[PDB]
């Protein structure tokens, strides 16, 4: 409605109307809320709204209105304070101070308007950052004094001091210049002795819990930076570790304080400080045992019940114990009078490790890794923790998470869908600790596992969960035992898992146990390599699982097959005793039968595994003969499909034919992936007909687009035709990336390839161009680019200008072409730079444009390569020396790169690239201040040094882009920047200081003298 009236400043502000807009926004809904929101934003963003602030704080009845008023002051204080006239500055200060004092002394306002007082305190701290102590060096004394006049004032002063410490020490790195941060840090340091007095007095005095908690909250911040003596040379540790642990109101913050105390590294030579470090831990654990929970308590249950703040307390307890013990447990390991304290603290951690809470378990698991890795090396220590470690073995074995390899899950035992990477890292961490625990006592580990297994056989503890977690644990400790103990161990496990297979007949039953056996056997390849008879049996069993109707078991059998082959392949190529032929021979001969029930993706994995085996045969003649045998089926289907495609080239209309072709190529891709350079004989068998097929498919796609429109590219028919092209490109890329005979690559593969792909890419409509062409060409250039200078030129001519035109209208369209485009330019620039030298001047200008275009991307893939191309190009030009092309390059483009780099440095929209931007800028500046540009950069009086002109150019550029800076700020910044162009660390700090100063008015130019 008329809510917009408050946006007019001609009249006076209708406070009651403002309060209605605010209430409409916070308490309203629907369209009224949405309109009020926009109005309030516009109101807040008015550069004169701050003048209305104090009359809102005076006459408004809505606390949210006053909050928004303070947000308006905060914006003014943080960005425009030093532009105000001095009288307006004192008025704002006096008004904010008075409002705070006024709210504290009204005991009813202090109770109910907490947010509004917190916001005012923060607003005052913003004024302090600008004015204190140089223009107010009595703030702390007056704050200390006024703390006695009232309890509410004293409590609120702790909040102000807390926020001040945060803004100065915790959050200043990004928000202030180096010089200003140091100034405020030194200022607080110089006055802390008095602050600590008021703090320690309040804590010893002890009014009521409100003032204590606020004082402790402020202490938590101080502990981030204050000298050690304030903590150890006073009685404050006794207060924290006893008095304030007893009351639950103060226990939460006190524990966080003691955690911060714990993480410092003590002067490791004074006995007294050691005895004090022991003592506050001893006190703290005693308070927990008597006031909270004994060490036997069931913390798993307490956490699950989640009464009051129990979950947060137990989290904080875990953080305290792990922090302290990781730093100081050695202080407790020698003195026998401290053994019980050491073990009780670790027993609390055992109990905490049983809680069902993944992120908390990861926190305790991190600590356990710290401990067991130390016991693995440190002499005479593991015996202390024998009982702790024994309990921990049980905890981890019973809480193993499902490994990646186990594809069967319950929801009814079915098949995985997603990759659980939150679970991937967890499994790795659990494995690491269990491996260490097994090394520490291999007898105890085996006895736990073998016994737990014995009670699965009995069905005494049978369940999905119990056999799974046990099986995963057993698999995870592979490599900890000696081959001999492992031998006996694995025999016992398999024998009993097999017994369990026959016992549990359900289809869910059998699937669970099958996955567990597959996981275990796949994890013990050393055992398999030594028992060929068993290995052969395992493989044949996996082949039978490839006909399972349960899709999960079936998929897992294929993954286990290749997992075993990757480690045991050698035993498949040799002729084993008692065997009539190498087992690879047996596999290949029955491959059609073995893979008949598999999905195509799974068949390809099977062929890939065979390729791994075949590559172990180093006799070239025998290897190539295995390769041709392996590829018999796809090569026969290929020979059929190409004879039937050359004659009447229309059979590719058949969707069934397109599917068959794609799977043939995908099979070749799979075998090429594992065989690498050894794949060349097979590639030569299909290469010519494959590129002819590439052209034939391309004609079909173009014909369909012409007849049906762009929408044709979405149809299943055209998508299947493009899959053929993509897989052909992937096959060629895969081989070339692993080729060892680059002469054959250049002389046989490259020319037919470029003839087949480049013009087709160039002359297709954009929506029909395959970004995979760019990816293929990147690999070609990377591996043989130096040998094909004319081929690299041909690539550029065909893909450069037309791809650029696809991606230079916005930052979003054709995202895959975008990424591959700059990967291709990058490799060309670093390996065949001569191709850019031959470019016509107009095209080389597009090249520079394309690089700076990459700068402005937020896509990290594009941005990083863009900055790298620019840096490599500058280097490429510099390597040419004093020649016309380099001289013309600097004349035409030096200042384009400087200005474009400065733009992304300062626009606040490309923070992620700061380091590479700074590097590029430092290189450009260093070029001038090393006189490595041998030509005047200007078109200004003659003989001027390029150093002088660069300063003039930059000063003028910055003066116009950031007109709120003074001339002295810009001159000081540039002076510091140019002097530091050989010291990247200091150079970057100066750039960071500049980015701070451009966000406010009146920045001090001497800040740039910091270094």
């Amino acid at each position: 409605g008329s809510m917009e009236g408050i946006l007019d400043f001609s009249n006076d502000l209708d406070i009651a109307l403002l309060d209605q807009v605010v209430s409409t926004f916070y308490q309203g809904s629907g369209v009224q809320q949405k309109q009020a929101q926009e109005i309030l934003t516009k109101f807040q963003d008015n550069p004169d709204a701050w003048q209305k602030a104090d009359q809102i704080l005076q006459f408004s009845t809505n606390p949210q209105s006053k909050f928004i008023a303070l947000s308006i002051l905060d914006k003014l204080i943080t960005r425009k304070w030093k532009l105000l006239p001095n009288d307006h500055r004192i008025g704002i200060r006096n008004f904010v101070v008075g409002m705070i004092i006024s709210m504290c002394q009204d005991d009813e306002v202090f109770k109910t308007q907490k947010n509004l007082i917190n916001k005012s305190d923060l607003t005052l701290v913003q004024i302090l950052k600008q004015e204190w102590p140089q223009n107010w060096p009595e703030f702390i004394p007056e704050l200390i004094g006024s703390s006695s006049s009232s309890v509410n004032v004293c409590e609120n002063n702790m909040i102000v001091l807390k926020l001040l410490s945060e803004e100065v020490f915790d959050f200043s790195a990004e928000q202030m210049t180096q010089a200003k941060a140091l100034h405020l840090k030194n200022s607080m340091s110089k006055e802390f002795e008095q602050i600590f007095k008021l703090c320690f007095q309040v804590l010893e005095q002890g009014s009521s819990s409100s003032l204590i908690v606020a004082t402790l909250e402020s202490l938590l911040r101080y502990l981030h930076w204050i000298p050690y003596r304030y903590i150890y040379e006073t009685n404050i540790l006794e207060l924290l570790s006893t008095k304030f642990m007893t009351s639950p109101d103060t226990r939460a913050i006190t524990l966080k304080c003691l955690t911060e105390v714990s993480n410092l590294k003590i002067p490791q030579d004074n006995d007294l400080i050691k005895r004090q470090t022991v003592l506050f831990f001893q006190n703290t654990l005693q308070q927990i045992a008597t006031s909270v929970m004994p060490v036997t308590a069931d913390l798993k249950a307490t956490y699950a019940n989640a009464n009051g703040n129990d979950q947060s307390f137990l989290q904080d307890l875990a953080m305290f114990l792990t922090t302290y013990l990781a730093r100081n447990r050695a202080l407790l390991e020698s003195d026998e009078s401290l053994r019980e304290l050491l073990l009780n603290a670790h027993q609390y951690l055992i109990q905490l490790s049983k809680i069902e809470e993944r992120e908390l378990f990861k926190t305790t698991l991190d600590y356990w890794h710290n401990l067991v890795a130390d016991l693995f090396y440190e002499p005479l220590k593991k015996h202390i923790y024998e009982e702790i470690c024994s309990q921990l073995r049980l905890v981890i074995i019973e809480n193993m998470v499902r490994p990646e390899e186990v594809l069967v899950v319950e929801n009814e035992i079915v098949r995985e869908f997603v990759k659980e990477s939150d679970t991937i890292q967890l499994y790795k961490s659990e494995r690491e600790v269990l491996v260490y625990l097994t090394h520490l006592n291999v007898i105890d580990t085996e006895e736990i596992m073998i016994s737990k297994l014995a009670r699965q056989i009995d069905g005494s503890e049978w369940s999905w969960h119990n056999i799974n977690t046990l099986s995963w644990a057993i698999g995870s400790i592979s490599g900890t035992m000696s081959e001999d103990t492992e031998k006996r161990f694995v025999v016992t496990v398999i024998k009993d898992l097999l017994g369990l297979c026959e016992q549990k007949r359900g289809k869910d039953n059998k699937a669970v146990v099958a996955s567990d056996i597959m996981y275990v056997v796949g994890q013990y390849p050393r055992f398999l390599k030594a028992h060929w008879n068993f290995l052969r049996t395992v493989i044949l069993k996996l082949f039978k699982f490839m006909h399972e109707t349960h899709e999960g078991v079936q998929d897992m059998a294929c993954d286990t097959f290749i997992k075993i082959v990757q480690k045991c392949k050698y035993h498949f190529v040799i002729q084993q005793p008692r065997e009539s032929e190498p087992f690879i021979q047996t596999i290949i001969r029955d491959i059609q039968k073995t893979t008949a029930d598999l999905q195509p993706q799974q068949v390809h994995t099977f062929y890939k595994a065979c390729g791994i085996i075949i590559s172990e045969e180093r006799s070239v003649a025998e290897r190539n003969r295995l390769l041709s045998d392996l590829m018999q089926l796809p090569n026969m289907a290929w020979d059929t499909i190409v004879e039937q495609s050359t004659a009447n080239p229309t059979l590719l209309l058949d969707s069934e034919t397109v599917k068959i072709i794609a799977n043939i190529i995908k099979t070749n891709v799979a075998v090429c992936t594992s065989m690498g350079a050894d794949f060349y004989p097979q590639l030569g068998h299909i290469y010519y007909n494959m590129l002819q097929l590439y052209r034939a498919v391309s004609s079909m796609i173009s014909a369909q687009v012409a007849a049906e429109g762009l929408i044709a590219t979405k149809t299943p028919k055209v998508r299947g035709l493009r899959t053929i092209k993509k897989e052909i490109l992937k096959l060629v890329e895969t081989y070339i990336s692993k080729a060892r005979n680059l002469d054959d690559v250049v002389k046989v593969l490259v020319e037919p390839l470029l003839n087949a792909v480049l013009e087709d890419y160039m002359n297709n409509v954009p929506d029909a161009r395959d970004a995979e062409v760019l990816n293929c060409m990147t690999t070609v250039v990377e591996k043989v680019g130096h040998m094909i200078p004319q081929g690299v030129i041909l690539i550029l001519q065909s893909v450069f200008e037309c791809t650029l035109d696809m991606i230079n209208k916005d930052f979003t369209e054709y995202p895959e072409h975008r990424v591959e485009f700059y990967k291709l330019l990058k490799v060309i620039n670093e390996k065949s730079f001569a191709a850019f030298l031959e470019l016509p001047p107009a095209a080389f200008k597009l090249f520079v444009d394309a690089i700076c275009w990459a700068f402005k991307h937020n896509n990290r893939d594009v941005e990083v390569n863009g900055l790298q191309i620019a840096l490599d190009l500058v280097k490429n030009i510099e390597r040419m020396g004093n020649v016309p092309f380099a001289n013309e390059f600097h004349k035409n483009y030096f200042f384009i790169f400087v200005s474009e780099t400065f733009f992304v440095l300062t626009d606040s929209d490309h923070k992620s690239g700061f380091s590479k931007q700074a590097l590029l800028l430092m290189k450009l500046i260093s070029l001038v201040y090393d006189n490595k540009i041998s030509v005047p950069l200007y078109q200004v009086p003659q003989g001027t040094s390029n150093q002088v002109y660069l300063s003039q150019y930059l000063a003028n550029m910055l003066s116009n882009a950031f007109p709120h800076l003074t001339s002295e700020q810009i001159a000081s910044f540039l002076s510091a920047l140019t002097k530091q162009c050989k010291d990247l660390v200091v150079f970057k700090g100066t750039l960071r200081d500049f980015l701070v100063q451009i966000k406010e008015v009146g920045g001090d130019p001497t800040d740039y003298l910091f270094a």
């Binding site: 929101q37 949210q64 926020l163």
Partner: protein, 208 residues
């Protein structure tokens, strides 16, 4: 039984996409920066009754921040979002948390690392630890793949209702009506249907 939930995090982390997925089931591919805040009601059906979240989806881009912390007033819970493919967004998590807890001193907060569907992950799981000292719950999530997409609201519902055993339950399904098509516009849904027939479905390379 409604609770105000504020959602904060760097621009582009997926806050609005995450909410819209829960609101309508859609996945918005375009990035349209939120201007200030967008408020949407969001209801879940639980074994303890319906719980309603008033989701205040705030802008992450500084130039569009609007009232900034003014949005946090009287929030009862929050989600802090970052993008596991952008390290800078995790580095800013302590800044969002700072501004949030200065207004909301004692509320349940979930930290969410979004976009775990992207292969080239940059914020490694092992380095995500900010939540530990701050008592935040943490989840890997993907608004695109729906990985863990329900877990932030399930956890918040449990903390707000005070029942750790709370679970989502199937909403009852009323009998649908028996409506015959309209012959007055029967000759018209030839057009609206032809358009839909010839507009390709998105992400045809997905498992579903």
């Amino acid at each position: 039984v409604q609770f105000k939930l504020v959602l904060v995090g760097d621009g582009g982390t997926g806050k609005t996409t995450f909410v819209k997925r829960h609101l309508t089931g859609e996945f918005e591919k375009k990035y349209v920066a939120t201007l200030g805040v967008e408020v949407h009601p969001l209801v879940f059906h639980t074994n303890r009754g319906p719980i309603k979240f008033n989701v205040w989806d705030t802008a992450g881009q500084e130039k569009f921040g609007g009232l900034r912390d003014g949005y946090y007033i009287q929030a009862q819970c929050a989600i802090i979002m970052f993008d596991v493919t952008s390290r800078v967004t995790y580095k800013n998590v302590p800044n969002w948390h700072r501004d949030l807890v200065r207004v909301c001193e004692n509320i349940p907060i979930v930290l969410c690392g979004n976009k775990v569907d992207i292969k080239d992950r940059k914020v490694k799981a092992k380095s995500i630890v900010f939540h530990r000292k701050k008592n935040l719950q943490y989840y890997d999530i993907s608004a695109k793949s729906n990985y863990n997409f329900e877990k932030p609201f399930l956890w918040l519902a449990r903390k707000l209702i005070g029942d750790p055993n709370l679970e989502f339950v199937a909403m009852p399904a009323l009998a649908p009506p028996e409506v015959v098509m309209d012959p007055a516009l029967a000759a018209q849904y030839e057009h609206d249907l032809e358009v839909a027939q010839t507009t390709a479905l998105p992400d045809e390379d997905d498992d579903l």
